[PDB]
Write a protein that holds these residues in place. Structure first.
Motif, PDB file in Angstrom:
ATOM      1  N   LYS A 110       0.859  -1.205   0.000  1.00  0.00           N
ATOM      2  CA  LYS A 110       0.000   0.000   0.000  1.00  0.00           C
ATOM      3  C   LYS A 110       0.890   1.249   0.000  1.00  0.00           C
ATOM      4  CE  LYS A 110      -4.618  -1.622   1.136  1.00  0.00           C
ATOM      5  NZ  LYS A 110      -5.725  -1.542   2.113  1.00  0.00           N
ATOM      6  N   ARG A 111       2.227   1.092  -0.052  1.00  0.00           N
ATOM      7  CA  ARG A 111       3.186   2.234  -0.158  1.00  0.00           C
ATOM      8  C   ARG A 111       3.848   2.296  -1.546  1.00  0.00           C
ATOM      9  NH1 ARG A 111       7.130   0.839   2.073  1.00  0.00           N
ATOM     10  NH2 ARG A 111       8.192   2.798   2.562  1.00  0.00           N
ATOM     11  N   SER A 112       3.480   1.424  -2.486  1.00  0.00           N
ATOM     12  CA  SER A 112       4.126   1.338  -3.825  1.00  0.00           C
ATOM     13  C   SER A 112       4.024   2.670  -4.582  1.00  0.00           C
ATOM     14  CB  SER A 112       3.579   0.189  -4.628  1.00  0.00           C
ATOM     15  OG  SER A 112       2.474   0.565  -5.431  1.00  0.00           O
ATOM     16  N   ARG A 113       4.970   2.943  -5.486  1.00  0.00           N
ATOM     17  CA  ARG A 113       4.961   4.162  -6.325  1.00  0.00           C
ATOM     18  C   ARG A 113       3.631   4.254  -7.082  1.00  0.00           C
ATOM     19  NH1 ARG A 113       8.406   7.937  -9.337  1.00  0.00           N
ATOM     20  NH2 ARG A 113       6.792   9.316 -10.172  1.00  0.00           N
ATOM     21  N   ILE A 114       3.332   3.261  -7.904  1.00  0.00           N
ATOM     22  CA  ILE A 114       2.176   3.350  -8.853  1.00  0.00           C
ATOM     23  C   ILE A 114       0.860   3.365  -8.058  1.00  0.00           C
ATOM     24  CG2 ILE A 114       0.940   2.134 -10.705  1.00  0.00           C
ATOM     25  CD1 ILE A 114       3.911   1.345 -11.697  1.00  0.00           C
ATOM     26  N   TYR A 115       0.710   2.576  -6.993  1.00  0.00           N
ATOM     27  CA  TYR A 115      -0.528   2.647  -6.177  1.00  0.00           C
ATOM     28  C   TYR A 115      -0.630   4.037  -5.544  1.00  0.00           C
ATOM     29  CZ  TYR A 115      -4.008   1.712  -2.532  1.00  0.00           C
ATOM     30  OH  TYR A 115      -5.090   1.745  -1.690  1.00  0.00           O
ATOM     31  N   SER A 116       0.471   4.612  -5.056  1.00  0.00           N
ATOM     32  CA  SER A 116       0.459   5.956  -4.410  1.00  0.00           C
ATOM     33  C   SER A 116      -0.035   7.017  -5.411  1.00  0.00           C
ATOM     34  CB  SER A 116       1.811   6.332  -3.835  1.00  0.00           C
ATOM     35  OG  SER A 116       2.734   6.731  -4.848  1.00  0.00           O
ATOM     36  N   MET A 117       0.379   6.916  -6.668  1.00  0.00           N
ATOM     37  CA  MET A 117      -0.072   7.803  -7.769  1.00  0.00           C
ATOM     38  C   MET A 117      -1.586   7.619  -7.961  1.00  0.00           C
ATOM     39  SD  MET A 117       3.232   7.025 -10.225  1.00  0.00           S
ATOM     40  CE  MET A 117       2.756   8.005 -11.640  1.00  0.00           C
ATOM     41  N   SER A 118      -2.076   6.376  -7.908  1.00  0.00           N
ATOM     42  CA  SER A 118      -3.524   6.093  -8.099  1.00  0.00           C
ATOM     43  C   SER A 118      -4.330   6.806  -6.988  1.00  0.00           C
ATOM     44  CB  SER A 118      -3.828   4.590  -8.132  1.00  0.00           C
ATOM     45  OG  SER A 118      -4.007   4.013  -6.842  1.00  0.00           O
ATOM     46  N   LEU A 119      -3.861   6.839  -5.748  1.00  0.00           N
ATOM     47  CA  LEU A 119      -4.661   7.428  -4.661  1.00  0.00           C
ATOM     48  C   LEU A 119      -4.733   8.942  -4.838  1.00  0.00           C
ATOM     49  CD1 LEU A 119      -3.518   5.438  -1.500  1.00  0.00           C
ATOM     50  CD2 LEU A 119      -5.579   5.111  -2.897  1.00  0.00           C
ATOM     51  N   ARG A 120      -3.648   9.603  -5.262  1.00  0.00           N
ATOM     52  CA  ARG A 120      -3.708  11.063  -5.475  1.00  0.00           C
ATOM     53  C   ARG A 120      -4.641  11.363  -6.648  1.00  0.00           C
ATOM     54  NH1 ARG A 120       2.119  10.767  -4.455  1.00  0.00           N
ATOM     55  NH2 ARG A 120       2.394  10.656  -6.732  1.00  0.00           N
ATOM     56  N   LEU A 121      -4.545  10.581  -7.727  1.00  0.00           N
ATOM     57  CA  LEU A 121      -5.380  10.838  -8.914  1.00  0.00           C
ATOM     58  C   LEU A 121      -6.853  10.585  -8.602  1.00  0.00           C
ATOM     59  CD1 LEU A 121      -4.731  11.733 -11.857  1.00  0.00           C
ATOM     60  CD2 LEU A 121      -5.060   9.335 -12.470  1.00  0.00           C
ATOM     61  N   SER A 122      -7.154   9.578  -7.776  1.00  0.00           N
ATOM     62  CA  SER A 122      -8.539   9.271  -7.356  1.00  0.00           C
ATOM     63  C   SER A 122      -9.097  10.452  -6.563  1.00  0.00           C
ATOM     64  CB  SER A 122      -8.546   8.012  -6.540  1.00  0.00           C
ATOM     65  OG  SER A 122      -9.854   7.780  -5.978  1.00  0.00           O
ATOM     66  N   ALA A 123      -8.350  11.045  -5.638  1.00  0.00           N
ATOM     67  CA  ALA A 123      -8.831  12.200  -4.844  1.00  0.00           C
ATOM     68  C   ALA A 123      -9.130  13.379  -5.760  1.00  0.00           C
ATOM     69  CB  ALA A 123      -7.792  12.594  -3.828  1.00  0.00           C
ATOM     70  N   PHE A 124      -8.266  13.630  -6.760  1.00  0.00           N
ATOM     71  CA  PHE A 124      -8.495  14.722  -7.727  1.00  0.00           C
ATOM     72  C   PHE A 124      -9.766  14.441  -8.537  1.00  0.00           C
ATOM     73  CE2 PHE A 124      -7.874  16.394 -12.064  1.00  0.00           C
ATOM     74  CZ  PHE A 124      -7.650  17.729 -11.826  1.00  0.00           C
ATOM     75  N   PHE A 125      -9.910  13.208  -9.058  1.00  0.00           N
ATOM     76  CA  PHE A 125     -11.116  12.834  -9.842  1.00  0.00           C
ATOM     77  C   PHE A 125     -12.398  13.016  -9.005  1.00  0.00           C
ATOM     78  CE2 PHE A 125     -14.340   9.651 -10.973  1.00  0.00           C
ATOM     79  CZ  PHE A 125     -14.620  10.055 -12.237  1.00  0.00           C
ATOM     80  N   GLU A 126     -12.445  12.511  -7.778  1.00  0.00           N
ATOM     81  CA  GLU A 126     -13.666  12.573  -6.949  1.00  0.00           C
ATOM     82  C   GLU A 126     -14.002  14.020  -6.608  1.00  0.00           C
ATOM     83  OE1 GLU A 126     -15.778  10.099  -6.369  1.00  0.00           O
ATOM     84  OE2 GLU A 126     -14.524   8.559  -7.281  1.00  0.00           O
ATOM     85  N   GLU A 127     -12.998  14.883  -6.440  1.00  0.00           N
ATOM     86  CA  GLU A 127     -13.237  16.314  -6.125  1.00  0.00           C
ATOM     87  C   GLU A 127     -13.946  16.972  -7.295  1.00  0.00           C
ATOM     88  OE1 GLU A 127      -9.870  18.518  -4.319  1.00  0.00           O
ATOM     89  OE2 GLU A 127      -9.772  19.581  -6.284  1.00  0.00           O
ATOM     90  N   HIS A 128     -13.574  16.630  -8.511  1.00  0.00           N
ATOM     91  CA  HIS A 128     -14.101  17.262  -9.742  1.00  0.00           C
ATOM     92  C   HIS A 128     -15.388  16.610 -10.272  1.00  0.00           C
ATOM     93  CE1 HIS A 128     -10.270  19.318  -9.590  1.00  0.00           C
ATOM     94  NE2 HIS A 128     -10.698  20.108 -10.554  1.00  0.00           N
ATOM     95  N   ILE A 129     -15.602  15.306 -10.081  1.00  0.00           N
ATOM     96  CA  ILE A 129     -16.782  14.612 -10.654  1.00  0.00           C
ATOM     97  C   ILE A 129     -18.055  14.885  -9.839  1.00  0.00           C
ATOM     98  CG2 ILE A 129     -16.698  12.366  -9.459  1.00  0.00           C
ATOM     99  CD1 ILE A 129     -17.254  12.954 -13.220  1.00  0.00           C
ATOM    100  N   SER A 130     -17.929  15.285  -8.573  1.00  0.00           N
ATOM    101  CA  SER A 130     -19.098  15.446  -7.670  1.00  0.00           C
ATOM    102  C   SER A 130     -20.099  16.464  -8.253  1.00  0.00           C
ATOM    103  CB  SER A 130     -18.666  15.796  -6.273  1.00  0.00           C
ATOM    104  OG  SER A 130     -17.840  16.941  -6.286  1.00  0.00           O
ATOM    105  N   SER A 131     -19.651  17.619  -8.765  1.00  0.00           N
ATOM    106  CA  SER A 131     -20.581  18.633  -9.318  1.00  0.00           C
ATOM    107  C   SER A 131     -21.195  18.127 -10.628  1.00  0.00           C
ATOM    108  CB  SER A 131     -19.966  19.984  -9.477  1.00  0.00           C
ATOM    109  OG  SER A 131     -18.858  20.000 -10.357  1.00  0.00           O
TER     110      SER A 131
END
Ligand SMILES: C#CCNC(=O)N1CCN(C(=O)c2ccco2)CC1
Length: 121
Positions: free
Chosen positions: A85-106
């Motif tokens: 759960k500390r891997s490079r590529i998984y860590s990138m997925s969690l930041r990108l998921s937070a950005f996507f969820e912030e923008h898709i809600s509206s």
């Protein structure tokens, strides 16, 4: 504000923003099985942002909820495939998921509001 069709261009612009994020690069194209030989042992349904964009531009999403289900599958595949759960590529997925969820809600709220107005009487 009751435009039933507005979600589609809103999702095209959000996908453009995701393609400018360095954190998206691993999620823009399919996994090479020579590099990750066990990938399809673990992942039943591959998904990437180029497939989401092509499905949208083909007119093969009916609603932003359907696009949201495919984007969320990119992120659940990364969490299922990662060896830590500390891997490079998984860590990138969690930041990108937070950005996507912030923008898709509206986008989702405005779409659902527009359909409710369409059926108001
Ligand atoms: C561009 C491009 C090709 N993508 C690609 O090779 N991968 C993305 C999906 N994946 C993962 O989510 C993951 C989690 C932990 C380690 O990898 C495997 C690697």
């Amino acid at each position: 504000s009751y435009d039933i069709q507005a979600w589609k261009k809103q999702c095209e612009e959000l996908l453009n923003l995701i393609f400018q994020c360095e954190d998206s690069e691993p999620f823009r194209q399919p996994v090479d099985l020579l590099e990750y030989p066990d990938y399809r042992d673990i992942i039943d349904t591959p998904m990437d942002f180029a497939t989401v964009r092509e499905t949208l531009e083909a007119g093969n999403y009916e609603s932003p909820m359907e696009l949201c289900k495919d984007v969320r599958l990119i992120f659940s595949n990364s969490k299922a495939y990662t060896p830590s759960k500390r891997s490079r590529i998984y860590s990138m997925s969690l930041r990108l998921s937070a950005f996507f969820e912030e923008h898709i809600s509206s986008v989702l709220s405005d779409y659902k509001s527009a359909l409710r107005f369409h059926k108001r009487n």
